[PDB]
Symmetry: D3
Subunit: 250 residues, 6 copies
């Protein structure tokens, strides 16, 4: 296999420069159902990939799995495999009370709560999204009529403690990580996720544009229970936003 994990060839990607980057393998095909001539390329470990075309040009939907490393490896290898533009799709909880379930997040830049981005840049270097990738997403979001928040999201190297989740075994979060929910909250930070800051940092540094969009399917800060359609209905909207935003990056 030409790469390490992905196991893909320059024409196995069909020279595709742009990628769409969900974390989960069953969303890969999903996003790929929106674009023509799709093919599951490969699943090696969490590296399930598909390939379809957009406005006539070959594009790659590829799962990052969870976190900076499998996103790194993916992105690295995707970059090894010729990927210029990366677009991250997903769902999130809002840590900000002005924000609702069903809305759409466009992240301008991220908090580096990983160790993974610290690998591609000296930590002062911000985890930040390319302008043109961010512009597409906005332009794509408004056009399906989204409630669209543009802001910073927090990218954690751990689901629970880095996101200050007390519903785990410990009920404990390290001193360094305690109070950080409000710290990001009042700072205006829209949400939490694990992957971006790596993706953003490594794209920022390397001459590869990145951007990220998400539907808000839950609220870390809010009361009402969302209908079962929470994931599925909001995910359509944002998957469609990420594809259209992609169709405008070509």
């Amino acid at each position: 296999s030409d790469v390490f994990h992905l196991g893909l060839t320059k024409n196995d990607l069909q020279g595709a420069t742009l990628a769409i980057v969900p974390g989960d393998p069953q969303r890969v095909e999903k996003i790929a159902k929106l674009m023509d001539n799709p093919v599951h390329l490969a699943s090696h470990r969490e590296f399930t990939s598909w390939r379809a075309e957009l406005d006539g040009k070959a594009v790659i939907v590829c799962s990052t799995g969870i976190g900076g490393p499998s996103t790194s490896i993916a992105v690295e290898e995707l970059a090894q495999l010729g990927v210029r533009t990366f677009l991250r799709i997903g769902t999130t909880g809002a840590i900000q009370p002005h924000i609702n379930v069903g809305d759409v997040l466009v992240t301008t830049a991220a908090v580096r709560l990983d160790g993974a981005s610290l690998h591609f840049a000296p930590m002062e270097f911000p985890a930040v999204a390319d302008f043109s990738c961010t512009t597409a997403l906005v332009n794509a979001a408004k056009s399906v009529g989204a409630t669209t928040h543009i802001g910073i999201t927090a990218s954690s190297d751990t689901f629970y403690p880095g996101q200050e989740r007390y519903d785990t075994f410990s009920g404990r979060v390290v001193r360094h990580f305690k109070g950080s929910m409000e710290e990001w909250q009042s700072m205006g930070v829209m949400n939490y996720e694990m992957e971006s800051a790596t993706l953003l940092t490594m794209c920022a540094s390397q001459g590869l544009r990145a951007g990220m969009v998400a539907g808000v399917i839950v609220n870390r800060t809010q009361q009402e229970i969302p209908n079962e359609e929470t994931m599925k209905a909001t995910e359509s909207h944002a998957v469609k936003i990420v594809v259209e935003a992609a169709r405008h990056l070509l």
Copy 2:
């Protein structure tokens, strides 16, 4: 005076939710002059404000002085005085060979090396521009025909040792700052200035719209000293870009 430093009051600002924030007192005046009904308001130390109109809307021009310390205050007191949108204008030089003299740079994000940025959010947190202002300033650079680069700018808390200048006659630069020139340069950063990472960070974590724009008066690797008929044109070029952008943010 409703603030500790500037010397302004509220009726002074005359509405004016948007301020232009050049570094030096000297550049301040000229900026407002390009606008409508400029009036000198307050000159105190590094802090010099002017009031002027744009499409019937009051604008403030106010000097922020040298580096993040004096930067951080003016921003604070302008906002403290009711200004929600900040636009830094300036001139700089280009640590990336593709970036010319007479070049404009809009910054989405700043490398945070200045310690005055730290007083707001940790190095985990990105020093980020407001998407709406960045869009306004890019669409401005694009409206004036400017040759623009959009990316990261590095920010230091000292002209000399934080910008990695051994130009200082001590010629020292303590270890943490050593290597960053061709480091950031390989790493995508456009240029170096001491203010942005204090402001963008400050506005991002204060809930304010910030964006930045700069004329490149020198491309510093390339040994051509720019036209003896000077860098004064590239400042007069950038000062339109901020006024044009602002016009669209009103």
Copy 3:
């Protein structure tokens, strides 16, 4: 599903206070097969669990994926699901010349370079194996005749830049990570893997028994590429060691 990620419930685990935690979904199945009555339970993304018996006692095998982020979750949800004892099995390569191919490594402690370990305890705190599990795994390596080294393993939060790989096609590695290969090598560390410092640390500070074991598929300084009849034996060798150890921890 009683946990956010895996897809497991309690009756699923069938008792089973002890889980085996390989990285990849693929190695998972085989492991449980060496045991009694294996049953595929849940395959979701990087998280794949199997249930199997040992001396009439239910064991879980569950994949943790790539690096500390995905690692940290599975561990969390397995424990969240009632598993107190964790045993990571894997294969690696040897940064110390005395360490061969076909070699086993039991880790007492991990160098914490991964940032996903940080979300639990500060770099002041050691990422430590459970003495009872380390004893079980050593007595196992000694029971299967394995040629073993016991010591520190280095852990990174990225395959490439945290493991000091300029193998990446960016080829970069920000300053904080530069030099560590022959650094750790002189400093006694056995090998490099991205998971242990997230788990051991996680279990040490969560009140859980953790230990780790690895087959060395490559000794990386010594330029001999290991037998073309492959590293598959050294994985089949180590997978006994974890099953043998576990047997003694029941």
Copy 4:
């Protein structure tokens, strides 16, 4: 211009080795009204300077503007311009309740709350005042009969958050900076200011003596409202102390 900012010549300073370093331009002339043959040298941005003579030798009063960078640049350039001894005059609030409005502070050393000093020394290196400069100030203070506190002052890279000022927009101070008022308070730290630690650090390192004195015109910790004469009356005392202390450094 011979320097960068200051725009001064070796005899434009008249070879003056010693400087007096207020932050504000209108105090420059003030301090210069106490010494013979004064001349405003130059105001470029915040770099207003005067030159007079003391006991027969030419001396420089020069404004640092706000913060380490404009103090750096000044001091740097002053050092570039041949300045050995620096003496900082100013006013301050006490963060210590045993201290009164009207009293005089002599700072032995500073807390580095800037990023600016981190430019001239590796942070372990203390921000500390020369002994002989400090001795003059004491000796000068006692001789006008001052209530003279000798101690550490905190030097911040931001007026408000670094000094834990909640009376701003945010009402918020970063986690890292919260509780620090009392942290310095009970430690015995006399007061806050922005400039020194840079000045102290860069003088400590470079074979240039520094010292600092201040009148206390307000109390961050105390009740009673000071008369309008607070600034002016206390400023005389300390301006006179800084000149006399200077007259004893020759």
Copy 5:
């Protein structure tokens, strides 16, 4: 003198590879009363040493005095003097309420609260005990029937503030060090001491095995007053454990 402090010769140690390492000089002889042909070697400052034999081989009991530096120097010099295996004996308070006065602690690894270990390894490198040294102590502990806790202990560079002791002058502990008792407490950290992490780190790195055992003579967290026999009676048990554990390292 052949070394620096210790002042010992290769046969003055009689080529002894193993050492026993109490902090206090009057425990040196004590531990040496359990092994044949003892001789006080030297007391230079806190470096009181004795030499006896164990199962026929010459061994060294040597005081480290207090802290990493005098332990370093000792250990360094002991290593300079040919010491491979180090075994630390002592007493401790439990910071964990599940633990009693009279019990025995075996430390697997330490928290680095010193600056001393940061000298022998880059802080990511854990302060960790050799397996075989730890195995002896367990095996030795059980055999006198000890109540034996195996776990992490916190190694501080200061008795009082690093251990969060409020019964001192200040009653104050630095922000960085406040709340750390519970931080280590709930993490499961068994106890506090000053010396180990240095000893552990420097042995971990250098091809020298280390381990540590202690009797619990007091509880930082508990009520009842222990009898006068607290030190003496519990110290016998653990001194005997450390000697027997030593007799099994040969």
Copy 6:
């Protein structure tokens, strides 16, 4: 004994608000002998105190041992026992070529590289001498005709790796400490010792008067080994300076 370590009570100190604090037990005795009515009080480990009179006023001499750990305790318990003024006396060597053998050094401030200083105040905070004690010790050095340098002394938490000694037979020194010899030397630091930054820092942040003084027994760059009739005179020289100073602090 009113303190955990020393073995002293209050009537022991006989008043005596001022203690002299040499490192080693051996130098202790001689010091007090130069004073009036010396009496051996307590010898416990590194802690040895003596009581003696000066101009009818009781003084304490007490050993602090090796480095900041043992340092920090004695200081604590002496003060805990009622001593507000501390004077460290010692001998060292000179990292600056202008500094001789037979030279005295009074320290205003210490570079904080020792981690035992950190337990009091952050690296933001300077490790500062008490002006009144520094004055007393300078006026003392000047009273005995001593050739003195006044400036910064570097302080490490280990004799070898924190003082950048590869003299150690491991010969290692982890990256953070590498380069500091000619670093501090260019940067103005006078010498290197492991205690001051623990004490000065400790007294500064505890509200105590601290100052330090040292004889230079070796100028270490200059390859002249000092007089074979030894460094014993330069210690006998410095021991007057502390006793003379103290005399003026009573």
